[PDB]
Amino acid sequence: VLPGLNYVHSGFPAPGLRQINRHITGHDDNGKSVFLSTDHGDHHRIMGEKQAVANILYSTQETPVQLNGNVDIDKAAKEEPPLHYHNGSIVRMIDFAPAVESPLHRAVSIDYGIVVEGVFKLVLDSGEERIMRQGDVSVQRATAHKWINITDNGTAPGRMMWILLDCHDVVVNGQVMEGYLGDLEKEYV
Amino acid sequence: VLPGLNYVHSGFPAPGLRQINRHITGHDDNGKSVFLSTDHGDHHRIMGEKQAVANILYSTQETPVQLNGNVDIDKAAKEEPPLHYHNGSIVRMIDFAPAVESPLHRAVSIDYGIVVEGVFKLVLDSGEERIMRQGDVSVQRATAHKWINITDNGTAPGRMMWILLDCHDVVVNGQVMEGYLGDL
Amino acid sequence: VLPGLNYVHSGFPAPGLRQINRHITGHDDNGKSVFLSTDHGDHHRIMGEKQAVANILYSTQETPVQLNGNVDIDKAAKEEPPLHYHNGSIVRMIDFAPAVESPLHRAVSIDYGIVVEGVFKLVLDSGEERIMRQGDVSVQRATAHKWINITDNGTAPGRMMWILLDCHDVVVNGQVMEGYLGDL
Amino acid sequence: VLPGLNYVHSGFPAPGLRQINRHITGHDDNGKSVFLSTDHGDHHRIMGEKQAVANILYSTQETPVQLNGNVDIDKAAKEEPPLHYHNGSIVRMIDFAPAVESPLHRAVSIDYGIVVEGVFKLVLDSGEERIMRQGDVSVQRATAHKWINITDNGTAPGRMMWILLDCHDVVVNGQVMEGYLG
Amino acid sequence: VLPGLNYVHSGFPAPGLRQINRHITGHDDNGKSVFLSTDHGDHHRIMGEKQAVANILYSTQETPVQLNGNVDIDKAAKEEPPLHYHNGSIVRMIDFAPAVESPLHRAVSIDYGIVVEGVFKLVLDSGEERIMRQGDVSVQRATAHKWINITDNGTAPGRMMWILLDCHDVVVNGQVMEGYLGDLEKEYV
Amino acid sequence: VLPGLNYVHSGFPAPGLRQINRHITGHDDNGKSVFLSTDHGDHHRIMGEKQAVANILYSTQETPVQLNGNVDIDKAAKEEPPLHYHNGSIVRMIDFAPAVESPLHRAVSIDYGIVVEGVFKLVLDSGEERIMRQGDVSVQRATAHKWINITDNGTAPGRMMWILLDCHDVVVNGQVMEGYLGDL
């Protein structure tokens, strides 16, 4: 019995989770600050056997970010970003079906994670774990981890949000700690 | 009478809001991923007349981030960051006392904002406004803006979180839109 | 200014409200009771200027209900039902944008209503009114009424669910109280 | 050992669940739509060894419903309805004590069910199941089933509401699927 | 318009508020500690025009309390208690209909109060005021005050609990701050 | 492993629970009722290996309480109170870390306890148990017991509040039911 099989029958948001509002601000051609768009995000991707849906709320591809000509908005909208942009950022929101586990993986990236709804178990490859509840924040520094939805004893969906930044390769005793994705590689090709 | 006057009496968290847990992961000498610390953030700063309190959960000063020797941790904890870091990031959580309202201002920054708890009204300098409830996200693109806590008709506290990133100067029709800190 | 202009930007569900699961049971080869469908409902209809979205959870067009060969399933899915079915039922769920309110209307219908999420004001053409919160239940006996979403002082979406049954024309003082659809 | 033994100690509502409002509208003598009632429902019945309590919010005994002279209100309040009405409807609300199970049963009836509070498990006679959280909707088409209240790992109460309508008898492979009460 | 007119149609609890569980413990004839009762409280009382309902969870009429022979249980169930007991305690829970105000009054007793559900406003005779949300605690030291239910802009019910203990008379510069109940004398003894 | 080991890293409130407002009223020099203080309680005390934290909201030391000259306020602030006060009262609030248990103990006092947030299990020395959810009240009459935090399957913090009053020694079969603190 695979957890969360076919739970996500309508893309984002997953059943039991609220639809969201993404506001994007900008400047008109008279210098006034205006609201450019209100939507449900972008680049909704169904993951696993319909066990989770991802939602890319924004992305940047350069540092510092160029906002003139609304170039940043169109680079974010015209292409589905990969796991992680070099010298840039991605804001990734994921809806988890009940009891759904992500594979133990490592992205070479510093990742600010915040639980938006539910309870999540952050497990590392050393066995160490932390239970993270709503509002809890993590600073994942290119470490090997897996995320586990444990909301209501594995019967409720949960939602998490990540802001992924670029990092240099972590070296420990002259050895580069290599990034790997396991079963998550099929979800970003 | 000033909104939120002497509401925050014990720093972070503000009355009515929950204490947080911040987890920072790292690497041990053998090469396994380990949890380096669990705490309530860093560099708490009272704002206004005890009308708010800020919480700096992390910050980076270069891109790509240098993680070796835990130097990112050291820089993040050594000194309180300014409004915004060139070629870097800041995670800033803020608790608002009831009905507390920020000054109209512009930071030359792109800001990812999420409403962690409460109901906030985002006001831009053109009068355009959007009410933001828990879970709603904004991409503030170097815009002159104002944040208003309106949770439960101005009787409850609210909490926001921003991730502030470095951007180039926004130039509209030849004129640099310069950022002002302002005051109400 | 319209109460909910362009709030519902992605159909059902409305922003701030949860996606649902609709489960339909049935019988298989050898008379085992099984699940036939788990979906988001059927017959989504944007109402107003994206001020509301309606969801038809189920409907029947006859009494008693004919279930053999799954004909009630086919009828319920093959065509979007009207306001109400003669000799039938409709399970219609509606999401209201903030402060959105229905026009003063009458249906020749006995409607069971339950507030699923939010707070609503039910006003009759007499002026009498009642505030209904979650779990509260209404039996509208072919009366002329309004529904006003008032959740969080007009800043939060709400959701109602109705079961609409057919009824005979109500007659007062020899007058048939004619149903009218008001504005919408 | 019994899941909800002696939990419901004051009728409706059960400990941990909210008291409700039921509003019934009607017409006065000059045609104005007015409110006739505000109460806690009707025909409250304790079930089992005080493991649950039912609340009948309304019922109709004919289709289409006859509203004139308020004879429907009279019929709905004068006698406790049975499990279901022929050519009729019943709105039944049930507060489940923690972990309380419903017996495996079948009624010849189409039931619209909505979780009002808590988390329930819907098990059918073939073993298949679906977990239903607040706001989820089920259409029970004369199938054999049970309801298990699993709210907060069996330590919290939950509340369901059903609208039971009449159906024709279900025949599969020439056999009429009989009802039973387990 | 009377704020909570005919809102409490079925006594305790008020519509929109939860029925409760009061557990009372004691000792068996063998010295082991046991649960003596589980119920919805005692001495339910409708206040005003079905505008509120009180629920007296327990009371004591002596200091220190005598628990032998269960005489404190019988004394608490035998009579409905007055506003406050001399040399004793009263745990009074009150369900407020939406927007219901208590009258300005002064009970000569120190009252611990906690908001159980909703948002209440505590206004004092000088006009000073505090908004009290679920979880907040007030220590009422024989002051003249009034409680206002403002839950969800006066459209939702709320619930307060109090523990009323005996105090001496408050004397300010020779003057006795005398008790008075205003409109609330209707609802006691 | 020890439940809640090092969970409460920043005193009161524990991570996951809200900061509180304690309001104390009194009289000014003219005889008007005014608010004397708005704070987070008093006498915060960590318990166990950072597994819980207690917050003494108020206390009295005499019956009836003396309030003139604010003597009761001073007596409540100047000393951290013991387990219970003779002829007096203690309002004790305690924040439990996930899955945290108190030892089987007896205090010779009558305790008015309410669940502020979470779910607790009250186990008595006879093995009988009750599950108490938010808003439920217990009257403890000098009985041997223990408190278990079972909030969200042992993974969430909980909060109780007691009011302890003095009581005469309980005698059962000519033997005094001695109080004891216990050892896990």
Measured at the CA of B56, the angle between CA B52 and CA B59, to 5 degrees, comes to: 150
Q: Which of D26, D58, D56, D28 is nearest to D44 (CA)?
A: D56
* E160 CA to centre of own chain: 7
For the A22-187 domain, the top CATH level (class) is mainly beta
**Chain D residues 49-68 with a CB less than 8 Å from chain C:** 57-58, 60, 63-68
Please check whether residue F21 is in contact with residue F38, taking contact to mean a CB–CB distance below 8 angstroms: yes
Q: Which residues of A touch D133 (CB under 8 A)?
A: 16, 155-156
Mark yes or no for CB contact C141/D34 under 8 Å. Answer: no
Instruction: Go through C107-139 and write b for each residue having 16 or more CB atoms within 10 A of its CB, e for each that does not.
Output: bbbbbbbbbbbbbbebbbbbeeebbbbbbbbbb
**3-class DSSP state of B107:** coil
* E strands present in chain B: 22-27, 33-39, 42-47, 52-60, 89-96, 109-117, 120-124, 129-132, 137-141, 145-149, 158-166, 171-172, 175-176
Cβ contact E–C (≥3 pairs, < 8 Å): yes
Secondary structure percentages of chain E, helix, strand, coil, to 5: 10, 45, 45
The continuous run of DSSP H or E covering D24 comes out as strand D22-27
Residues F177, F105: Cα–Cα separation, whole Å:
11
Q: Which of D99, D166, D110, D119 is nearest to D138 (CA)?
A: D110
Mark yes or no for CB contact C10/A39 under 8 Å. Answer: yes
Count Cα neighbours of C99 within 13 Å in the Cβ-side half-sphere: 10
**3-class DSSP state of A186:** helix
Residues D117, D125: Cα–Cα separation, whole Å:
24
The residues, any chain, with a CB within 8 Å of residue B9's CB and separated by 6 or more, are B15, B50, F21, F38, F39, F40
Please check whether residue F27 is in contact with residue E177, taking contact to mean a CB–CB distance below 8 angstroms: yes
Give B48 to chain A, closest Cα distance, Å: 24
**3-class DSSP state of D61:** coil
Count Cα neighbours of F48 within 13 Å in the Cβ-side half-sphere: 23
The continuous run of DSSP H or E covering D76 comes out as helix D71-78
Residues A133, A121: Cα–Cα separation, whole Å:
9
Closest Cβ opposite residue E153 in set B16, B98, B153: B153
The residues, any chain, with a CB within 8 Å of residue F125's CB and separated by 6 or more, are E32, E33, F104, F106, F143, F144, F145
Please check whether residue B128 is in contact with residue B146, taking contact to mean a CB–CB distance below 8 angstroms: no
Breaks in chain E after (C-N > 2.5 angstroms): none
Q: Which residues of A touch D136 (CB under 8 A)?
A: 15-16
Residue that has been written with the tokens 């920054």 in this structure: B109
- Distances, alpha carbon F34 to alpha carbons A101, C100, D30, E129, E176, in Å: 55, 42, 54, 9, 17
| Tokens found for residue B58 | 């992390």
Please check whether residue E88 is in contact with residue E59, taking contact to mean a CB–CB distance below 8 angstroms: yes
Residues A3, C115: Cα–Cα separation, whole Å:
32
**3-class DSSP state of E74:** helix
Please check whether residue C167 is in contact with residue D70, taking contact to mean a CB–CB distance below 8 angstroms: no
The continuous run of DSSP H or E covering E45 comes out as strand E45-47
Phi and psi at residue A171, to the nearest 5°: -120, 130
Identity of the residue numbered F117: E
Mark yes or no for CB contact D23/C170 under 8 Å. Answer: no
Phi and psi at residue B70, to the nearest 5°: 55, 30
| Tokens found for residue A60 | 């940047």
Identity of the residue numbered A133: R
Q: For A13, name the nearest residue in chain C, comparing CA atoms only.
A: C19
Mark yes or no for CB contact E16/C133 under 8 Å. Answer: yes
CATH superfamily for domain C33-167: Jelly Rolls (2.60.120.10)
Please check whether residue E94 is in contact with residue E55, taking contact to mean a CB–CB distance below 8 angstroms: yes
For this experimental structure, what is the resolution in angstroms?
2.7
Breaks in chain B after (C-N > 2.5 angstroms): none
Residues D43, E30: Cα–Cα separation, whole Å:
44
Give E152 to chain C, closest Cα distance, Å: 7
* Strand pairing class (A89-96; A158-166): antiparallel
* A103 CA to centre of own chain: 14
* Strand pairing class (B137-141; A22-27): parallel
Q: For A95, name the nearest residue in chain C, comparing CA atoms only.
A: C19
Give the residue from D133, D137, D152 with the most A CB atoms within 10 Å of its CB, the best one to mutate.
Answer: D133
Give C59 to chain D, closest Cα distance, Å: 10
A66, burial (CB in 10 Å: exposed 0-12, middle 13-18, buried 19+): middle
Contacts C–E by Cβ distance under 8 A: 13
Residues A83, A188: Cα–Cα separation, whole Å:
6
- Distances, alpha carbon E91 to alpha carbons B91, E47, E132, F112, in Å: 46, 17, 19, 8
* Strand pairing class (B129-132; A33-39): unpaired
**3-class DSSP state of B70:** helix
SS (H, E, C) chain F: CCCCCCCCCCCCCCCCCEECCEEEEEECCCCCEEEEEEECCEEEEEECCCCEEEEEEEEECCCCECCHHHHHHHHHHHCCCCCCCCCCEEEEEEEECCCCECCCEECCEEEEEEEEECEEEEEECCCCEEEEECCCEEEEECCCEEEEECHHHHCCCEEEEEEEEEECCCEECCEECCCECCCC
Please check whether residue D156 is in contact with residue D98, taking contact to mean a CB–CB distance below 8 angstroms: yes
Q: Which residues of D touch C87 (CB under 8 A)?
A: 63-64
CATH topology for the E22-181 domain: Jelly Rolls (2.60.120)
Give the residue from A6, A17, A19 with the most C CB atoms within 10 Å of its CB, the best one to mutate.
Answer: A19
**3-class DSSP state of C26:** strand
Bond prior to D157 in cis (omega within 30° of 0): no
The residues facing B89 across adjacent strands are B60, B165
Please check whether residue B27 is in contact with residue A172, taking contact to mean a CB–CB distance below 8 angstroms: yes
Longest dimension (CA), chain F: 59
Q: Which of E155, E119, E170, E173 is nearest to E7 (CA)?
A: E155
Order across the sheet with F158-166: list the strands: E33-39, E22-27, F137-141, F109-117, F158-166, F89-96, F52-60, F42-47
CATH superfamily for domain D22-168: Jelly Rolls (2.60.120.10)
| Tokens found for residue F34 | 């005014």
Identity of the residue numbered F29: D
CATH topology for the F22-167 domain: Jelly Rolls (2.60.120)
Q: Using CA of residue D76, residue D81, residue D85, residue D91, what is the dihedral sign? A: positive
Q: Please spell the DSSP secondary structure of A154-170, one letter per residue.
A: TTS-EEEEEEEEEBPPP
> CATH classification of B22-176 is 2.60.120.10, yes or no?
yes
Q: For B162, name the nearest residue in chain A, comparing CA atoms only.
A: A163
| Cβ atoms within 10 Å of B130's Cβ, excluding its own | 16
Please check whether residue A127 is in contact with residue B27, taking contact to mean a CB–CB distance below 8 angstroms: no
The residues, any chain, with a CB within 8 Å of residue B5's CB and separated by 6 or more, are B49, B50, B51
A115 close to F (CB below 8 A): no
**3-class DSSP state of C15:** strand
* Strand pairing class (A137-141; B22-27): parallel
Residues E93, E11: Cα–Cα separation, whole Å:
13
Q: Using CA of residue A104, residue A109, residue A110, residue A111, what is the dihedral sign? A: negative
Instruction: Go through B175-184 and write b for each residue having 16 or more CB atoms within 10 A of its CB, e for each that does not.
Output: eebebeeeee
E137 close to F (CB below 8 A): yes
Distance between the two ends of chain B, CA-based, in angstroms?
14
**3-class DSSP state of E116:** strand
Q: Which of B14, B21, B61, B70 is nearest to B41 (CA)?
A: B21
Give C15 to chain B, closest Cα distance, Å: 9
F39 close to B (CB below 8 A): yes
Method by which this entry was solved? X-ray
Q: Please spell the DSSP secondary structure of B12-55, one letter per residue.
A: SSPBTSB---EEEEEE-TTS-EEEEEEES-EEEEEETTTTEEEE
The residues, any chain, with a CB within 8 Å of residue B74's CB and separated by 6 or more, are none
Give B66 to chain A, closest Cα distance, Å: 6
Identity of the residue numbered B184: L
Residues A157, B39: Cα–Cα separation, whole Å:
27
Closest Cβ opposite residue F153 in set A133, A136, A153: A153
Mark yes or no for CB contact E119/B153 under 8 Å. Answer: no
Q: Which of A117, A56, A62 is nearest to A92 (CA)?
A: A56
Residues A16, E50: Cα–Cα separation, whole Å:
38
**Chain E residues 145-184 with a CB less than 8 Å from chain C:** 152-153, 155-156
**3-class DSSP state of A132:** strand
SS (H, E, C) E151-186: CCCCCCCEEEEEEEEEECCCEECCEECCCECHHHHH
Q: Which residues of D touch C21 (CB under 8 A)?
A: 130, 132-133, 136-137
The continuous run of DSSP H or E covering C53 comes out as strand C52-60
The residues facing A54 across adjacent strands are A45, A94
Please check whether residue D98 is in contact with residue D151, taking contact to mean a CB–CB distance below 8 angstroms: yes
- The alpha carbon torsion through D58, D61, D62, D68 (nearest 10 deg) reads -60
Closest Cβ opposite residue D166 in set C65, C72, C125: C65
Residues D165, D65: Cα–Cα separation, whole Å:
13
